[PDB]
Amino acid sequence: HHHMRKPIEHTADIAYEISGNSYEELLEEARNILLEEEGIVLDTEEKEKMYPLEETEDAFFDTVNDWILEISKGWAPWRIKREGNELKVTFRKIRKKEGTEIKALTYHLLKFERDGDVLKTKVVFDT
Ligand SMILES: [Ca+2]
């Protein structure tokens, strides 16, 4: 008989608490996390996509995960501009990456909480 240490797999790998005064600022913080965590260095070429400005965890989840898909295609979220009830996201071509590859934003602990002027939530990513 034996015991063999084995690796544990988690979808909850890294966590941050993001805060801001609006849904758009939480997305700006999700963007900041992706660039920083992945050590993304940007080229100058740009590309843009539209996302619905819906202040829900579901829209947040869909948006950030779409950014991760774009990152796998060589494009990183860079700027965010509100246009009516939608958000125009400008992506920049990724020159290089140096860091931890983020696989996805999970639904773990994703819940917007209001505290005065502050909107906040934990965001848990899978690596
Ligand atoms: Ca994992």
Side-chain angles (χ1 to χ4, degrees):
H1 50 79
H2 310 99
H3 56 280
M4 304 310 293
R5 184 64 175 269
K6 294 296 189 193
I8 32 73
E9 294 181 310
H10 295 289
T11 42
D13 291 302
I14 66 176
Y16 301 72
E17 182 69 26
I18 54 175
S19 53
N21 295 135
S22 72
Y23 173 78
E24 182 176 351
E25 291 192 348
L26 296 187
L27 280 171
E28 285 163 39
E29 283 306 329
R31 169 201 65 201
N32 292 344
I33 291 176
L34 294 179
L35 298 177
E36 161 194 304
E37 182 56 41
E38 297 204 334
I40 293 168
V41 181
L42 304 176
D43 267 324
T44 63
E45 178 179 32
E46 292 171 21
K47 158 176 144 154
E48 307 176 313
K49 300 177 70 175
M50 298 299 318
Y51 295 96
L53 181 48
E54 180 188 313
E55 302 150 287
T56 68
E57 290 86 355
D58 286 337
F60 188 85
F61 177 96
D62 292 345
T63 299
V64 173
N65 278 312
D66 187 67
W67 292 352
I68 286 159
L69 176 57
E70 284 297 329
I71 282 174
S72 74
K73 293 181 178 180
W75 296 94
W78 174 58
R79 287 286 172 275
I80 306 168
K81 174 181 163 46
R82 173 168 178 163
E83 250 161 39
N85 66 338
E86 297 178 273
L87 298 169
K88 170 188 278 188
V89 175
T90 306
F91 295 79
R92 273 178 65 181
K93 192 63 188 180
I94 294 174
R95 190 184 303 163
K96 56 172 171 297
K97 296 197 302 184
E98 325 143 309
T100 321
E101 310 97 296
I102 289 176
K103 296 180 186 168
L105 168 64
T106 69
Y107 268 108
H108 296 301
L109 306 176
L110 189 51
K111 178 193 192 293
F112 299 145
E113 303 185 327
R114 283 182 50 198
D115 185 337
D117 293 46
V118 187
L119 189 62
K120 64 183 177 197
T121 184
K122 251 176 173 48
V123 283
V124 173
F125 301 83
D126 179 30
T127 61

